């Protein structure tokens, strides 16, 4: 039940740091703010690691064997994580701002660029058990006079080229005996040396500077020494080289400039293979695949991630995420897709499994406040502060209709009739609820009666009534449909911030400014429950706050709430560092989730370190922009009083951890919470827990297998469910012969019927046995169709999962099968000649 | 003795075991090396932050520690190890069974004295060698020469002389020549300590009867005599800060400071360290500093500082007494109870027989702190009753903690020995709370529990009554009276609905907490000793007196699993966080892991010392245990968190002597195909079908909007001219005649050769296998390159290949896709020559198989018709 | 070398160009191109391949021999003989040099009559369809397949990588046999894209 | 990186990122000394009234 775990982070594909390709080239590792996301491009799967740094990630790297990953934040704190087990081995603090980290191509050693020192360590063995100090230092080198920009390993794991801000590139030998071989310093660059590389033969060294000059170094007579034989120049009018990478095998040089355009060059000929522009923002990181055919670029400002196939001039990947902009989220009725509304004015559809944006919409001028799906699922509606409500048709991606009030009011909430024939929106400056007809676009009527701004709306899925709440400390139930219009106001102790409607349509829950979740009976208009939440909410002290978090009344209330589809749980979130999951009938907190652990976000900590405080004030509040070397970083475009609705540069204050919306997955035991860092998705998919139901001493994994060998299929299946082991259920499920399926399905106890249906839906979506699963579903529906009808809300999520399997994969197969049948008949029956 | 699930990680809470610590200087900084059982720890003197710990535990307990610059020398049994940064660099093994006792390193000489009055000298092989390794000679002190060796010291400016200090007198040995240069006069009192003075030729000697001697070796005569009657000197040290001070530590736990210039006592620090544990085992002035570091056997390390004099003139006379600066410590006796404070593995709660409760930090030792016992002022206003002389609370038998309401009010309950009430603590404040919970039936507290919400505290009395208090207000709310004997366990489910109790009378009571009703009562064969409740799974295990662990499901009130095998009483046990394992410890010196799904013991350990407590981390990463000996907490790492562990039952007989693979690893891999008649999709991503059909349109979207700029002068064969890997279809090399359109022999593609081979052999299994492996781009290229000219052999063969594939019923959704691509690329060719017999016959056979695969449509249409109807109406 | 340093099959297909000696006969129409280009043909053969080069004015043939004391690569003679043949077939010198520099280039040779027995105007029409107006069709095949083609009357010579010159052959054959031009041009667009793609 | 001029305005001392310190004669504009190689680049230079040359 209430065993949820962070699974993946949508809405963001790249924030900062260096993106790295997996050695096989089929996975891309991208730092997403405080965590690391892994995208499997070939299998179309993604996952984000659970471990969390305390500041944004700065450098990451995965060894060639693909077993160990090291991630370093901006303070030098490092985490060594076992890639296969997705578990943290050790935490290491390098006590300095490490700029780059790179495993040796052998895998035995990895090097650190920590300021002006190059640190070489020995890799802990993955097979060995965890110890107090797994890392063993190998050597620390101090030749550079300023910070090291980057480092490069030789192909034989023997030499390291380091490039620093000293306008110099310097070479080291990993073995002390070979120090004489490489003890040279490469000079002559006017600006910072961004990158230095070896040729494939390792007889040539290329160095690239920020000013845009490439130097080709060779060991030649003037008696033999390294000399700049050739010099090439990027004649960029004002753009500076921002990131450089080189692939020795293909002799490919990919350079990213601050103007937002990158060039591919062929060395040592300096031939311009390509030149493209991703936008106006700098290209922060560039990486090359092992084969050399895929190039990954990332821009931090807009959070872009571009994987380019320079061979075919095609985009394997082209994605852009949102940071501190997602105002709302919506699941598709089948749960395959999740939509997000951003302050930019853009609505994006994200795929849960792959983790990429399928489509984008840019009709809205201003921030989009709400997004909601029709019951049917084809059509989508969104509202924005520009004063328009827009209906979207997903099959053709057209804004087939747009609604607008006569007085040009900003809209902050939205509700859609289950029939999809009426749309109602509310505002924070009108006090009325505007209603439109979907087919016509005409404003049917304006509902009046609230003495304060309308904060939220919702239609009852069955009864089709409308529930609205306002800061007027009241809730009104509108019976808009029917010959007679009736309104039933219900008073509440404080301002209502959120509202959730029961799937039954019989009760409504409201989150108030007091930190209370009160449940009312719609038909009787009397309170049936109340949950106290002020104590549960975790709220952090801001750096700018002059008052404690305990005394702070900033956010001790939930601005968004949602029911579980069964109707027994509420998930709540707000402008706070907590997501709380309550149980409605018993009014207890099932679990609390910490949204973020990033000290970059302002509201993470309840207590701040007193060392930061000084006689002047907090050390964090001091602006260090002037120290930055680049002019663009020094420029301050912040408006004095802006709080929201502008770019991050405009605010001048740190982003605040907050949850804008939360929802349950229609088809799975998971919920998604839109927050500043992105769309966090918590799911119960792993199911490592042992949660038996109705065991006895006789029930055992051994006993179930004995039943199978004796051909007692029903008993074997039931005993598997009583253990509730996924592997044992799968073993029994596939061992039942086809002839015996109808007999077993008709005889399964009613108690275990919801469990089998859940397993089939989750198993069928990704399994290969399409026909076997369809036989089981046919047997179950025919045998127990009436029972499922009597209890719709117990079986709602399971049924939606089965329908998704029958629609999204099964129908696609027969559609490809059936068209061949007709294409076949035309070719043979028809007469072809001349 | 070796576990397959757990491995030792380190010990927590131990700073020193009483062996004199060693001080070494790196540049201006200082560090202290302290012994902890079989391992040593290095602290930074400025902050007392742990820096390094010995990589591996020595086979035998360490006896001596000497540190010089980066290298540290640790002596154990007859071997002396050399360590740098906690990693052993070289091990010196002496050639006699006599154990090393004392250790001295000056220059290139390492002197090790065994308990048989034999001194072994080791020398550096090379002058520039970092540490001595080579064996030089052996010097033995006979009984006629002197008594038992007290310590080895080297005085400055002495070429190759070792000042051996014995109980009877002092001796001067020349290590290079191995000769006795000088023998001091006999001393009436036994010598116990020696310390070289900062002056030349003078070594301070401490006797057993409170006498300190400034013996001068050059003159061989006494210089001074300090007297400390009825005391025993344990340590000596001089102040090198420019003030002639001498600090004398005593076994009584006192530290005296003398002013040598003025012949006066500056101050005496009383009871800095316990007399029971050896008092002041080591007290050393930091070189050139006013800071003095003290240690003792009570698991504590302290630092004191001398402040500047307050008098502008005569600062020498007006000496400020030493001030406590900083210290590190832990329990003085083994912990009695332990608990994990939070969901993460940051902090652990510990209680010991020394009447002190500690909060230990796993992530950093400096964060470890002791919770205060200062009492709050009573709310009523009456004077609190207690002795004016302050004493610590009695030993803690039980503890219960929650974090639902941390920072709001009390969130810990503790039970004390022979005490009729339970005390509360606050984790946020790290201080004892303001509430006390009484049994109200004249019985001692035997069990304490808290609800998940953090509002209620449950107390179980030895007389059988369960009292329920409110943590916020400390007001008694409810009282349950079912048990007639002591209640040894109380637990409440996460939902705050059903409550469970157990007692020595053997009954297990089930209560409805909200309705306050007796849901049921269950009687067990033997008295119950302890309870652990797993809230997520609603399972709780009971340790019975018959040496069994009985797992019970609270929902149904029946025994589900019973565990046997322990040979003695079960001291403690704990659930795994996932609720799948139970790890239990017993008095028979074993820790067993039990797998609940199969109800058998999968792992077994033998501990040298009986483990008194066992606790899993809520993460599951770590397992913490405490033992009847040792002041620290043993932390184990859960290896199952990084790999699968077999659940095969352990061998009982072999374990006693020392004192279906998929099921074993709790996994199952789905079959390739359940039955031949059943249609099965391919083993791969489901987007491959979509990628193949709509490849062109997907690629058009991929192309950049604006054409990329490129240099006019570009190599035509750049893609091929690559130094050397790309495995694309383009990068294919021929394998080894009349020209043939499809491919000339010796110049033919791999796919076409497979196709022709299959046609003759009348089986395309090899061809179908490689088709599935082809990339979507490669698949399109091969089909489109098929020969489209008469007699149309390749097209006919391909249709025969796909027709065979549909018979197998495996990967059929690719075979449908391949046939769809064939019509797309060669539909006109087939249409123009539909009357050709070969194409007509091959096509007809494909339809015969394809017609059969229409049952799948019926299954899909049925389920949509019903599933839509069932969910809607 | 820098201190950081690390520690007889015939490419041409369809004609048997094969101390060893190789002889390549130069037709009359390639005599003058050989003369003006000779200054650039012998240096790579004599220096890189360490071969003993000669052209026999009497027999109008180019003679290559392996020098046992100088030559080190056993395949140099065959590689040199292959390179001279490409120039003999008509390929530009820079195109011929690609054979020496690279290791994965072959020449595929066939005649129009091999594909189909065309005579008179039909044969001329077939050659025209391959070339197209201003050589557009042949040029299109070169860029898409990344192959160099020499259409000497009814004799076609295709230079490039194995798979590359395979796709050119089907396009040329379809043009000979008379498939509709749009299908061939549509073919050339896809094969260009698919060939460069990683997957 | 840094420039220093004496009180009399006759000499100048300049340090560069190339690890070189050069003493100049700014009345006649003649280079007097060039300490070509320094252990590390000199961040700062100053000249006192008495004429002491300081380097960091």
d(CA A284, CA A725): 47
- What's the CA gap between A571 and A581, in Å, rounded? 4
- Considering the domain architecture, whether residues C75 and C112 belong to the same structural domain is answered as no
Buried b or exposed e, range B396-434, using 16+ CB within 10 angstroms: bbbbbbbbbbbbebbbbbbbbeebeebbbbbbeeeebbe
Residue C141 in domain: yes
H or E element at residue B687? helix B687-693
Q: Give first-to-last CA distance, chain B, whole Å.
A: 64
Residue partners of C6: CB distance under 8 A and separation at least 6: A155, A156, A201, A202
Chain A CB within 8 Å of residue D17 CB: yes
Those residues with Cβ within 8 angstroms of residue A205's Cβ, 6 or more apart along the chain or in another chain:
A161, A169, A171, A186, A196, A197, A198, A199, A216, A217, A226, C4
* Same-domain pairing of C96 and C108: no
Which structural domain range is residue C84 located in?
Answer: 19-101
Q: Is A166 within 8 Å of D18 when comparing Cβ atoms?
A: no
C-beta of residue A91 within 8 angstroms of C-beta of residue A56: no
Do B723 and A731 lie within an 8 Å CB cutoff? no
Task: At D15, give phi and psi (nearest 5°).
Answer: -115, 140
Q: How far is A791 from chain B (nearest CA, A)?
A: 9
Tell which of B342, B538, B773, B859 to mutate to test the A interface (max A CBs under 10 Å). Answer: B859
Residue A650: in which H helix or E strand, if any? helix A648-651
> For chain D, how many residues are written?
56
SS (H, E, C) B787-834: CCCCCCHHHHHHHHHHHHHHHHCECHHHHHHHHHHHHHHHHHHHHHCC
Rounded to the nearest angstrom, the gap between the alpha carbon of residue B425 and the centroid of all alpha carbons in its chain is 27
CA–CA dist D1, C193 (Å, integer): 54
Residues of C whose CB is below 8 A from B739: 14, 110-111, 114-115
A828 close contact with B: CB closer than 8 A:
yes
* Experimental determination approach used: cryo-EM
Contact A586 B495 (CB under 8 A): yes
CB contact at 8 A, A715 and A708? no
Give SS3 for A615.
coil
Q: Is B734 exposed, middle or buried (0-12, 13-18, 19+ CB in 10 A)?
A: middle
| Shortest CA gap C110–chain B (Å) | 7
In chain C, alpha helices (H): 31-43, 76-89, 93-101, 112-115, 121-131, 136-145, 162-177, 181-196
Same domain, C39 and C86: yes
Q: Is C16's Cβ below 8 Å from some Cβ in B?
A: no
The domain boundary residue, chosen from C101, C125, C152? C101
- What single-letter DSSP state applies at residue A807? I
Residue closest to C157 by CA, chosen among C109, C113, C99, C93: C109
Same domain, C46 and C97: yes
Work out the number of other CB atoms within 10 angstroms of the CB of residue B480: 21
Burial class (CB in 10 A: 0-12, 13-18, 19+), B302: buried
CA dihedral of residues B549, B552, B558, B562 (deg, nearest 10): -30
Contact A819 B856 (CB under 8 A): no
**d(Cα A568, Cα A562) in Å, to the nearest integer?**
11
Residue B394 CA to residue B414 CA, distance in Å, equals 11
Query: CB A820: neighbour CB atoms within 10 A?
Result: 18
Using CB atoms and an 8 Å cut-off, which of residues 423-452 of chain B contact chain C?
A: none
Asked if A341 contacts A349 with a C-beta cutoff of 8 angstroms, the reply is no
DSSP 8-state class, residue B873: -
- Comparing alpha-carbon positions, the chain A residue that sits nearest to C191 is A312
Q: How far apart are the first and last CA of chain D?
A: 11
Query: With helix as H, strand as E and coil as C, how does B46-73 read?
Result: CCCCEEEECCCCCCCCEEEEEEECCEEE
Asked if residue C192 and residue C113 are part of one domain, the reply reads yes
Residue found by looking up tokens 């013996």 in the block: B215
Residue B263 backbone dihedrals phi, psi, to 5 degrees = 60, 50
Beta-bridge mates of residue B561: B551
Torsion of CA A30, A33, A34, A40, to 10 degrees: -20
H-state helical runs in A724-769: 726-735, 741-747, 753-766
Residues C95, C143 within the same domain: no
CA distances from B531 to A345, A498, A664, B163, B566 (A): 57, 42, 36, 62, 17
- Contact check, Cβ <8 Å, B671/A705: no
In a domain, C14, yes or no: no
Q: Which residue has the tokens 């020498």?
A: B316
CB < 8 Å to D18, chain A: 187
DSSP character for B765? Answer: H
Of how many residues is chain C composed? 199
What is the rounded distance in angstroms from the CA atom of residue A623 to the CA atom of residue A603?
19
Work out how many domains chain C is built from and give that number: 2
Q: Is the residue at C71 inside a domain? A: yes
Contacts of A166 in chain D (CB under 8 A): 17, 41
Selection from C148, C35, C29, C17 nearest residue C81 by Cα: C17
Residue C1 is assigned to a structural domain of this protein: no
- A167–D17 C-beta distance less than 8 A: yes
Residue in C3, C196, C198 closest to A294 by CB: C198
Helix B837-852, helix A811-829: angle, nearest 10: 150
Query: Closest chain B residue to A23 measured between Cα atoms?
Result: B725
CA A577 to chain centre: 17
Q: Which two tokens stand for residue A302?
A: 């807009």
Rounded alpha-carbon distances, angstroms, from residue C7 to B647, B798, C2, C4: 50, 50, 12, 9
Residue B724 has, within 13 A of its CA and on its CB side, a CA count of: 13
CB B684 within 8 A of CB B672: no
Task: Decide which of C101, C118, C147 is a domain's last residue.
Answer: C101
Query: Of C73, C101, C129, at which residue does a domain stop?
Result: C101
For residue C149, tell me if it sits in a domain: yes
CA B797 to chain centroid, in Å, comes to: 63
Q: What is the DSSP letter of A216?
A: E
Q: Is there a domain that residue C59 lies in? A: yes
Structure tokens that stand for B700 in this block = 């058009």
Which own/partner pairs from B347-351 qualify as long-range (CB within 8 Å, at least 24 positions apart)?
Answer: B348/B12, B348/B624, B348/B633, B349/B399, B349/B401, B349/B412, B350/B13, B350/B626, B350/B633, B351/B395, B351/B396, B351/B399, B351/B414
- Interface contact flag, A772 B87, Cβ < 8 Å: no
Are residues B857 and A730, on separate chains, in Cβ contact within 8 Å? no
Q: Which residue has the tokens 């400002």?
A: A301
In the beta sheet, which residues pair with residue B542? Answer: B531, B550
**CA distance to partner chain D, nearest, from residue A48 (Å):** 45
Instruction: Find the closest chain A residue to C197 by CA distance.
Output: A312
Nearest CA in chain B to A42: B685
DSSP secondary-structure letter at A88?
Answer: E
Distance from CA of A656 to the nearest CA of B (A): 23
- E strand map for B504-546: 507-512, 517-523, 528-534, 539-544
Altogether, the residues listed in chain A come to a count of 834
Give the 3-state secondary structure percentages of chain D, helix then strand then coil, rounded to 5. Answer: 0, 45, 55
Instruction: For residue B319, give the nearest of B262, B253, B250 by alpha carbon.
Output: B262
Which residues in chain A have Cβ-Cβ distances shorter than 8 Å to B496? 586, 588
Q: By the 8 A CB rule, do C79 and C107 touch?
A: no
A198 close contact with C: CB closer than 8 A: yes
Within-domain flag for C32: yes
DSSP helix/strand/coil, C25? strand
Cβ A775–B859 below 8 Å, yes or no? yes
| CA atoms of B691 and A574, how far apart (whole Å) | 41
**CB-based contact, C156 to chain B, within 8 Å:** no
Q: Would you say the C-alpha torsion A284, A290, A292, A293 has a positive or negative sign?
A: negative
CA pair distance A240, A211, nearest whole angstrom: 6
| Polymer length of chain B | 873
CB contact under 8 A, B843 and A272: no
Residues 6+ positions from A790 with CB-CB distance below 8 Å: none
Whether residues C90 and C134 share a domain: the answer is no
If residue B123 lies in a helix (H) or strand (E), which one and from where to where? strand B118-123
Question: Given an 8 Å threshold on Cβ–Cβ distance, is C161 in contact with B739?
Answer: no
Same domain, C87 and C115: no
A87 touches chain C (CB under 8 A): no
Is the domain of C107 the same as that of C86?
A: no
What is the rounded distance in angstroms from the CA atom of residue A239 to the CA atom of residue A586?
A: 63
To which residue do tokens 């001030």 refer? Answer: B323
Contact B487, B466 (CB under 8 A): yes
- The H or E element that residue B782 is part of is helix B776-784
Handedness of CA A283, A285, A290, A294 (dihedral sign): negative
Peptide bond into C137 cis (omega under 30): no
> What letter would DSSP give residue A55?
S
Assigned domain for C165 exists: yes
Is A218's CB within 8 Å of C198's CB? Answer: no
Separation of alpha carbons B427 and B617, rounded Å: 18
Does residue C45 sit in the same domain as residue C83? Answer: yes
Same-domain pairing of C106 and C66: no
Contacts of A237 (CB under 8 A, 6+ apart): none
Q: C97 and C23: one domain?
A: yes
Q: Is C113 on the interface with B (CB under 8 A)?
A: no
How is A672-733 classified by DSSP, letter by letter? EEEESS-EEEEE--S--S---SS--TT--HHHHHHHHHTT-HHHHHHHHHHHT-HHHHHHHH
Two tokens, residue B35:
């012994």
Cβ separation A293–B685 shorter than 8 A: no
Task: Name the nearest CA neighbour of A109 among A147, A60, A160, A57.
Answer: A160
Q: What is the resolution of this structure in A?
A: 3.2
Query: Taking CA B157 as the corner, what is the angle to CA B152 and CA B161, rounded to the nearest 5 degrees?
Result: 40
User: Is C196–A311 a contact, with Cβ atoms under 8 angstroms apart?
Assistant: yes
CA atoms within 13 A on the CB side of B428: 13
Question: Is A102 exposed, middle or buried (CB count within 10 Å of its CB: 0-12, 13-18, 19+)?
Answer: buried
φ, ψ dihedrals at C112, nearest 5°: -60, -35
What does R_g of chain A's alpha carbons equal in angstroms? 30
Q: How far is B731 from chain C (nearest CA, A)?
A: 7
């Amino acid at each position: 039940k209430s065993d949820f775990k962070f699974s993946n982070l949508l809405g963001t594909v790249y924030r900062q740091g260096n993106i790295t390709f997996s050695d096989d080239g089929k996975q891309l590792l991208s730092p997403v703010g405080n965590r690391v996301s892994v995208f499997d491009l070939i299998n179309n799967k993604s996952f984000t690691f659970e471990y969390e740094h305390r500041k944004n990630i700065a450098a990451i790297d995965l060894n060639k064997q693909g077993t160990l990953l090291i991630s370093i934040d901006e303070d030098g704190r490092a985490i060594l994580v076992n890639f296969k087990a997705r578990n943290v081995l050790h935490h290491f603090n390098f006590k300095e701002k490490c700029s780059a980290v790179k495993f040796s191509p052998d895998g035995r050693l990895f090097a650190l660029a920590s300021g002006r020192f190059l640190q070489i360590w020995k890799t802990p063995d993955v097979n060995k058990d965890r110890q107090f100090a797994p890392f063993v230092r190998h050597r620390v080198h101090a030749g550079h006079f300023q910070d090291i920009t980057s480092l490069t390993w030789s192909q034989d794991s023997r030499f390291i080229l380091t490039t620093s801000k000293d306008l110099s590139a310097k070479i080291w030998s990993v073995d002390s005996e070979e120090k004489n071989l490489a003890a040279t310093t490469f000079n002559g660059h006017r600006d910072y040396v961004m990158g230095a590389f070896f040729s494939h033969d390792q007889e040539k060294i290329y160095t690239v500077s920020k000013d845009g000059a490439v130097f080709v170094w060779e060991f030649t007579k003037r008696k033999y020494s390294w000399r700049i034989t050739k010099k090439h120049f990027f004649y960029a009018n004002q753009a500076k080289v921002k990131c450089v990478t080189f692939h020795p095998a293909t002799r490919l040089l990919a350079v990213g400039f601050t103007s937002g355009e990158f060039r591919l060059y062929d060395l040592p000929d300096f031939t311009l293979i390509q030149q493209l522009s991703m936008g106006q923002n700098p290209v922060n990181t560039v990486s090359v695949n092992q084969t050399g055919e895929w190039l990954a670029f990332g821009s931090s400002k807009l959070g872009q991630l571009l994987v380019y196939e320079w061979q075919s001039e095609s985009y394997i990947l082209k994605q852009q995420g949102h940071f501190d902009s997602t105002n709302s989220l919506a699941y598709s009725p089948d749960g395959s897709r999740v939509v997000t509304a951003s302050e930019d004015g853009k609505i994006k559809v994200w795929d849960i499994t792959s983790g990429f944006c399928l489509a984008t919409f840019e009709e809205h001028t201003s921030s989009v406040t709400a997004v909601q799906f029709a019951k049917r699922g084809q059509v989508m509606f969104s509202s924005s502060l520009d004063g328009t409500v827009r209906a979207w048709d997903l099959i053709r991606y057209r804004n087939f209709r747009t609604f607008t009030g006569t007085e040009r009011i900003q809209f902050n909430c939205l509700a859609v009739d289950p029939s999809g024939e009426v749309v109602c929106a509310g505002s924070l400056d009108n006090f009325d609820i505007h209603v439109w007809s979907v087919q016509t676009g005409q404003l049917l009527d304006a509902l009046s009666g609230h003495e304060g701004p309308v904060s939220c709306l919702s239609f009852s899925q069955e009864n089709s009534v409308l529930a609205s709440a306002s800061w007027d400390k009241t809730i009104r139930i509108w019976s808009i449909f029917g010959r007679s219009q009736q309104v039933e106001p219900i008073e509440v102790y404080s301002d209502v911030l959120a509202l959730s409607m029961r799937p039954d349509g019989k009760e409504v829950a409201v989150s108030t400014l007091k930190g209370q979740i009160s449940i009312f009976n719609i038909e009787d208009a009397k309170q049936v429950g109340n949950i106290d939440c002020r104590k549960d909410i975790i709220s952090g002290r801001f750096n700018q706050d002059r008052f404690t978090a305990k005394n702070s009344e900033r956010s001790k209330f939930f601005t968004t709430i949602h029911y579980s589809f069964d109707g027994m749980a509420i998930v709540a979130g707000g402008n706070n560092n907590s997501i709380c999951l309550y149980d409605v009938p018993n009014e207890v907190l099932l679990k609390r989730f910490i949204v973020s652990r990033n000290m970059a976000l302002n509201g993470t900590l309840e207590f701040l370190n007193s060392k930061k405080m000084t006689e002047a004030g907090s050390l964090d509040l001091i602006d260090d922009a002037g120290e930055n070397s680049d002019l663009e970083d020094r420029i301050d475009n912040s408006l004095p009083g802006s709080q929201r609705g502008g770019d991050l540069s405009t605010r001048k204050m740190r982003p605040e951890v907050r949850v804008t919306s939360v929802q349950f997955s229609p088809t799975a035991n998971a919920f998604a919470a839109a927050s500043t860092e992105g769309l966090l998705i918590y799911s119960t998919n792993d199911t490592i827990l042992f949660d038996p139901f109705d065991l006895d001493v006789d029930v055992t994994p051994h006993s179930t297998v004995e039943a199978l060998r004796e051909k007692q299929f029903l008993n074997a299946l039931v005993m598997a469910f009583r253990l509730n082991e996924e592997y044992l259920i799968n073993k029994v499920y596939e061992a039942i012969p086809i002839k015996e399926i109808p007999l077993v399905a008709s005889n399964i106890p009613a108690i275990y019927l919801p469990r089998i249906l859940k397993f089939i839906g989750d198993f069928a979506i990704e399994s290969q046995h399409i026909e076997f699963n369809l036989i089981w579903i046919k047997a179950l529906l025919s045998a127990s169709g009436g029972y499922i009808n009597e209890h719709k809300y117990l079986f709602s999520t399971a049924m939606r999962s089965i329908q998704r399997f029958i629609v999204r994969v099964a129908k696609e197969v027969v559609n490809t099968t059936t068209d061949n049948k007709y294409t076949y008949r035309f070719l043979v029956s028809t007469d072809g000649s001349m | 003795k070796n576990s397959k699930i757990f491995s030792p990680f380190r010990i927590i809470g131990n700073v020193s075991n009483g062996v004199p610590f060693a001080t070494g200087t790196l540049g201006s900084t200082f560090y202290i090396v302290t012994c902890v059982g079989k391992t040593f720890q290095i602290y930074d003197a400025n902050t007392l932050h742990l820096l390094f710990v010995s990589e591996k535990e020595t086979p035998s307990s360490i006896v001596a520690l000497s540190a010089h610059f980066h290298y540290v020398y640790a002596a154990y049994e007859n071997k002396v190890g050399i360590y740098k940064r906690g990693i052993e660099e070289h091990l010196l093994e002496l050639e006699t069974d006599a154990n090393v006792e004392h250790l001295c390193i000056f220059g290139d000489y390492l002197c090790a004295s065994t308990d048989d009055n034999s001194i072994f000298i080791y020398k550096k092989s090379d002058p520039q060698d970092k540490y001595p390794s080579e064996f030089y000679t052996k010097l033995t002190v006979t009984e006629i020469q002197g008594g038992e060796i007290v310590s080895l010291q080297h005085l400055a400016t002495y070429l190759n002389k070792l000042t051996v200090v014995t109980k009877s007198n002092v001796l001067l040995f020349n290590v290079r020549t191995g000769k006795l240069v000088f023998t001091s006069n006999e001393f009436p009192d036994q010598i116990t300590t020696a310390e070289p003075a900062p002056v030349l030729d003078i070594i301070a000697l401490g006797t057993v009867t409170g006498e300190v001697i400034m013996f001068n070796m050059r003159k061989g005569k006494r210089i001074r005599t300090i007297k400390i009657p009825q005391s025993r000197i344990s340590s000596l040290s001089f102040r090198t800060d420019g003030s002639s001070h001498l600090s004398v530590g005593t076994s009584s736990g006192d530290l005296i400071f003398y002013d040598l210039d003025r012949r006066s006592r500056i101050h005496v620090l009383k009871n800095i360290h316990r007399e029971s544990y050896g008092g002041v085992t080591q007290a050393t002035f930091l070189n050139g500093q006013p800071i003095i570091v003290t240690s003792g056997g009570d698991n504590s390390l302290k630092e004191y500082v001398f402040d500047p004099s307050l008098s502008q003139g005569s600062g020498d006379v007006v000496v400020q007494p030493p001030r406590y600066l900083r210290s590190r410590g832990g329990h003085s006796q083994p912990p009695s109870y332990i608990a994990f404070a939070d969901s993460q593995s940051h902090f652990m709660l510990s209680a010991s027989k020394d009447r002190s409760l500690w909060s230990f930090s796993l992530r950093k030792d400096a964060q470890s702190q002791e919770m205060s016992q200062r009492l709050h002022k009573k709310q009523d206003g009456g004077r609190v009753g207690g002795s004016t002389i302050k004493s610590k609370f009695p030993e803690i038998v039980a503890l219960a903690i929650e974090n639902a309401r941390i920072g709001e009010w009390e969130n810990i309950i503790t039970a004390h020995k022979d005490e009729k009430f339970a005390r509360t603590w606050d984790m946020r404040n790290k201080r004892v709370g303001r509430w006390t919970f009484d049994t109200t039936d004249d019985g001692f507290v035997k069990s304490v529990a808290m609800s998940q919400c953090g509002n209620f505290g449950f107390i179980g009395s030895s007389n059988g009554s369960i009292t329920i208090y409110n943590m916020q207000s400390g007001i008694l709310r409810k009282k349950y009276k079912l048990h007639k004997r002591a209640v040894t366990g109380i637990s409440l489910d996460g939902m705050n609905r059903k409550m469970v109790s157990c007692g020595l009378d053997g009954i297990v009571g089930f209560y409805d907490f909200n309705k306050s009703t007796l849901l049921g009562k269950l009687k067990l064969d033997a008295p119950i000793t302890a309870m652990v409740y797993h809230r997520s799974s609603d399972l709780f295990a009971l340790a019975l007196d018959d040496l069994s662990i009985v797992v019970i499901d609270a929902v149904t009130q029946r025994v589900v699993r019973q565990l046997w095998g322990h040979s003695n009483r079960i001291t403690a046990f704990d659930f795994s966080p996932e609720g799948r394992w139970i790890v239990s410890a017993s008095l028979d010196s074993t820790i067993r892991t039990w797998d609940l799904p199969t109800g058998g013991c999968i792992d077994g350990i033998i501990v040298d010392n009986v483990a008194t407590n066992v606790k899993f981390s809520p993460n599951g990463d770590l397992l913490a245990t405490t033992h009847v000996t040792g002041n620290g907490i043993c932390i184990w790492t859960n290896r199952a968190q990084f790999k699968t562990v077999s659940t095969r039952t352990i061998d009982e007989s072999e374990f006693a002597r020392m004192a279906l693979n998929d099921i074993d690893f709790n996994t199952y891999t789905s079959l390739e195909q359940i039955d031949k008649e059943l249609l099965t999709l391919s083993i791969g991503p489901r987007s491959k079908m979509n990628t193949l059909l709509h490849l062109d349109v997907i690629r058009k979207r991929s192309k950049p909007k604006e054409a990329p700029k490129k240099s006019e002068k570009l190599p035509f064969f750049l893609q091929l001219s690559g130094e050397k890997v790309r495995e694309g279809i383009a990068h294919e090399t021929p394998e080894e005649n009349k020209f043939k359109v499809t491919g000339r022999l010796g110049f033919e593609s791999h796919f076409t050769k497979q196709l022709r081979e299959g046609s003759q052999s009348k089986d395309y299994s090899s061809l179908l296998a490689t088709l599935i492996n082809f990339s979507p781009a490669a698949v399109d290229l091969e089909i489109r390159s098929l020969n489209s000219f008469e007699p149309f052999d390749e097209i006919v063969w391909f249709i025969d290949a796909l027709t065979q594939g549909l018979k197998s019923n495996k990967n059929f959704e690719l075979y449908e896709t391949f046939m769809s691509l064939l019509f797309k690329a060669h539909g006109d060719v087939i249409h123009a020559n539909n009357k050709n017999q070969d194409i007509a016959s091959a096509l007809q056979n494909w339809e015969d198989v394809h017609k059969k695969e229409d049952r799948l449509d019926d299954l899909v249409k049925f389920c949509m018709g019903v599933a839509a109807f069932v969910t809607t109406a | 070398v820098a201190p950081t340093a690390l520690k007889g099959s015939s490419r041409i297909i369809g004609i048997n160009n094969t101390f060893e000696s190789r002889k390549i006969m130069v037709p009359p129409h390639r005599m003058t191109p050989l003369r003006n280009s000779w200054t650039k043909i012998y240096p790579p053969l004599v220096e890189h391949l360490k071969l003993q080069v000669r052209m026999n004015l009497k027999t109008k043939s180019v003679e290559l021999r392996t020098n046992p004391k100088f030559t080190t690569d056993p395949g140099a003679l065959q590689k040199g003989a292959d390179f001279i043949k490409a120039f003999t077939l008509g390929f530009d010198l820079d195109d011929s040099i690609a054979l020496l520099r690279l290791d994965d280039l072959y020449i595929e040779t066939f005649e129009v009559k091999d594909v189909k027995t065309l005579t008179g105007d039909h044969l001329s029409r077939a050659i025209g369809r391959i070339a197209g107006k201003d050589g557009k069709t042949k040029f299109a095949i070169e860029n898409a397949t990344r192959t160099r083609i020499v259409l000497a009357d009814s004799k076609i010579h295709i230079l490039g990588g194995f798979t590359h010159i395979r796709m050119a052959r089907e396009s040329v054959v379809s043009l000979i046999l008379g498939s509709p031009p749009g299908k061939v041009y549509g073919n050339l667009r896809t094969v260009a894209s698919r060939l460069k793609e990683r997957y | 990186n840094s420039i220093a001029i004496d009180r009399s305005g006759y000499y100048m001392a300049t340090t560069g990122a190339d690890r070189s310190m050069k003493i100049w004669d700014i009345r006649n504009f003649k280079q007097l000394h060039s300490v070509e190689s320094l252990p590390t680049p000199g961040t700062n230079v100053s000249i006192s009234d008495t004429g002491l040359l300081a380097l960091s």
